[PDB]
């Protein structure tokens, strides 16, 4: 449907009221089923209208016009619904031509720390609601962890690169508003082993199927067997994979044993039969001589001498019957024994090559979570799986920077302004920043509220890059300590001619060892110009940051030379190497669900801080210090859409507090 699709594109259930809606419309959700369906339709329809054309503001009046009875009957209901949707940034978010210009009279003053997507998204919403907004940004540019390299026609993202499906993605709305060149990624990705030879198709499929079986197994180990604590410490994903592999190696050995154990049983039956046959051959041999000696006595003979020949004759045919029956039994055991030698069970679980190709699939997983698998929580690493978008993954040909720059228009952004101290009290806040160039030039910003979009890496930094006065409570700092902040780097290789296959968007490279499985494990080609982008993932990311760009470019050319040949690989015109862990305005790439953490910590990070009263026995103050960013959004962590959504959320929470709901 069209109304049902609008709810889906807004990540809302089309036929049910959410928790957020229950809070703003308790009268409706506590009331009769008919009023709820009216509410749900108005919401779904208002969304459809906004989504069908998100380039121009959808006003309340415009909404009411396009509604029909009995839904357009109640005007206060339609107004309440439109207001909720606007406030919570489900309509009139991003970059829309405004119908009624913003009132010159601004209400309330907000300082926003960071000009990343989370910061910019919040700032626009707040300015849109008529608050006074100023962003403080340490960098000389906006976009933060969305960073695009540019020189001539060369264009490559060192930060966010991929739109992970448009189905329910708010970047779908932003892509209709901003000119992003969204180009589908072709899933086809060939591997190339240490030498430079493609993994044989039949084998590639086998290892990939084993990787997915191994993952599926860790999930079973977690949810069914409850293998989630070991020696008080919480179980890592890496530990679970080790345990699952060892159990598969055990079974291979257990299997061999049982097969050789049934061969000895057959050989011990054969031994016991052959012994019975050797002893019977001797008794037959002896009894034949006895028959001969009896038959030597020529007729005529008395009946006892005749009986002796006859009795020995019958006794010898009897024993010759047994031996023939035993020779039958021997033949079928010798056949059974040849069938067991013919069908031996599996020699090994995985060969040295298999384990190297499997290590690439682990590197892919270490890339995705931007951390070694030994750090990931087994139970909760995939806790956001249910909220994943539908549709093909896309890249930005223009570069992702086109988005924040678009969002930055019309906003009071102080660049080269590094926040040092955040002060929050019952009367309001003051933020103390410095000029990044001359660190002695000091700035003081007084505000009603502070929105902190500082990355988890920065919040973790010990000793602190930013001091909170008073200090953040134990429940906030404990969450910061518990949560994982990963690392993932990119090597940009700019050439004058394409020596790679243009139809293949990305191709893997298998590492020599487990230790180096993340090191330049994957190459991306997603641009018009001849640019190849190499990923450094897993344990490699941290270590490769202490190595010069030349050496790194060297190792890249080597690996490329091995696949396409020395003649085909020229020296790159331009080279760039990201070092996100060393970047003091990031201190890493993006959040991961660390062992001992959960999605619940992401919710603690989103919780605003309320200062104590100034004078004792004074009423409970309002909240002053708010938090947004990828580490604050539990259902969309470590993404640009997550950042975007976290910004919209805090804008609504701040507006509701300082302008009223």
């Amino acid at each position: 449907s069209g109304v049902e699709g609008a709810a889906f594109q807004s990540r809302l259930p089309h036929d049910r009221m959410t928790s957020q809606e229950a809070a703003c419309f308790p009268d409706i959700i506590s009331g009769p089923q008919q009023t709820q369906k009216v509410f749900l339709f108005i919401r779904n329809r208002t969304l459809q209208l906004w989504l069908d054309n998100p380039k121009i503001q959808l006003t309340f009046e415009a909404t009411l016009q396009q509604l029909e009875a009995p839904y357009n009957s109640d005007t206060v209901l339609v107004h309440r619904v439109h207001s909720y949707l606007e406030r919570h940034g489900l309509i009139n978010f991003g970059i829309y031509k405004r119908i009624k210009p913003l009132p010159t009279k601004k209400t309330g003053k907000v300082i926003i720390i960071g000009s990343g997507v989370s910061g910019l998204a919040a700032a626009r919403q707040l300015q849109s609601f008529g608050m006074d907004v100023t962003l403080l940004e340490a960098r000389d540019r906006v976009g933060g962890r969305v960073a695009t390299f540019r020189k001539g026609n060369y264009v490559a993202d060192l930060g966010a690169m991929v739109v992970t499906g448009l189905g329910g993605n708010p970047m779908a709305v932003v892509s209709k508003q901003v000119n992003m060149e969204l180009a589908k990624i072709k899933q086809k990705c060939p591997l190339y082993e240490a030498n430079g030879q493609a993994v044989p198709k039949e084998k590639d499929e086998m290892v990939e199927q084993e990787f997915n079986r191994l993952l599926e197994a860790t999930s079973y180990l977690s949810h069914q067997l409850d293998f989630n604590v070991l020696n008080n410490k919480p179980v890592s994903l890496g530990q679970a994979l080790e345990v699952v592999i060892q159990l598969q190696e055990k079974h291979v050995k257990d299997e061999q044993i049982e097969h050789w154990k049934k061969i000895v049983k057959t050989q011990e039956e054969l031994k016991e039969l052959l012994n019975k046959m050797v002893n019977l051959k001797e008794k037959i041999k002896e009894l034949h001589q006895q028959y001969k000696e009896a038959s030597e006595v020529k007729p005529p003979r008395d009946i006892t001498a005749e009986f002796l020949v006859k009795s020995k004759h019958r006794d010898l045919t009897a024993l010759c019957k047994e031996y023939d029956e035993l020779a039958e039994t021997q033949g079928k055991l010798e056949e059974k024994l040849q069938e067991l030698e013919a069908n031996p069970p599996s020699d090994v679980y995985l060969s040295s090559r298999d384990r190297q190709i499997l290590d690439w699939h682990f590197a892919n997983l270490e890339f995705a979570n931007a951390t070694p698998l030994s750090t990931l929580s087994l139970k909760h690493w995939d806790q956001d799986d249910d909220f994943e978008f539908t549709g093909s993954h896309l890249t930005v040909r223009n570069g992702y920077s086109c988005v924040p720059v678009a969002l930055a228009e019309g906003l009071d952004i102080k660049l080269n302004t590094a926040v040092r101290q955040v002060r929050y009290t019952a009367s309001g806040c003051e933020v103390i920043a410095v000029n990044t160039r001359s660190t002695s030039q000091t700035f003081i910003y007084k505000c009603d509220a502070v929105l902190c979009t500082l990355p988890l890496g920065v919040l973790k930094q010990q000793p602190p890059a930013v001091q909170f006065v008073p200090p953040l409570p134990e429940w906030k700092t404990s969450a910061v300590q518990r949560m994982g902040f990963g690392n993932l780097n990119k090597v940009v290789l700019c050439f004058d001619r394409v020596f790679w296959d243009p139809s293949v968007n990305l191709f893997g490279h298998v590492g020599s060892t487990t230790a180096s499985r993340g090191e330049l494990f994957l190459f991306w080609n997603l641009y018009k110009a001849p640019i190849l982008l190499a990923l450094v993932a897993g344990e490699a990311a941290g270590i490769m940051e202490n190595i010069s760009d030349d050496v790194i470019v060297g190792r890249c050319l080597a690996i490329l030379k091995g696949i396409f040949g020395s003649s085909a690989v020229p020296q790159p015109k331009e080279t760039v190497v990201s070092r996100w862990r060393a970047d003091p305005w990031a201190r890493g790439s993006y959040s991961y669900v660390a062992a001992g953490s959960s999605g619940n910590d992401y919710d603690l990070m989103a919780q605003p801080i309320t200062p104590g009263p100034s004078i004792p026995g004074a009423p409970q103050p309002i909240p002053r210090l708010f938090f947004a960013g990828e580490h604050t959004i539990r259902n969309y962590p470590a993404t640009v859409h997550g950042a975007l959504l976290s910004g919209l959320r805090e804008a609504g929470r701040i507006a509701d507090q300082f302008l009223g709901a």
Partner: peptide
């Protein structure tokens, strides 16, 4: 997270 995995099946 999981979403970023290459060759997702």
């Amino acid at each position: 997270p999981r979403s970023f995995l290459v060759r997702r099946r």
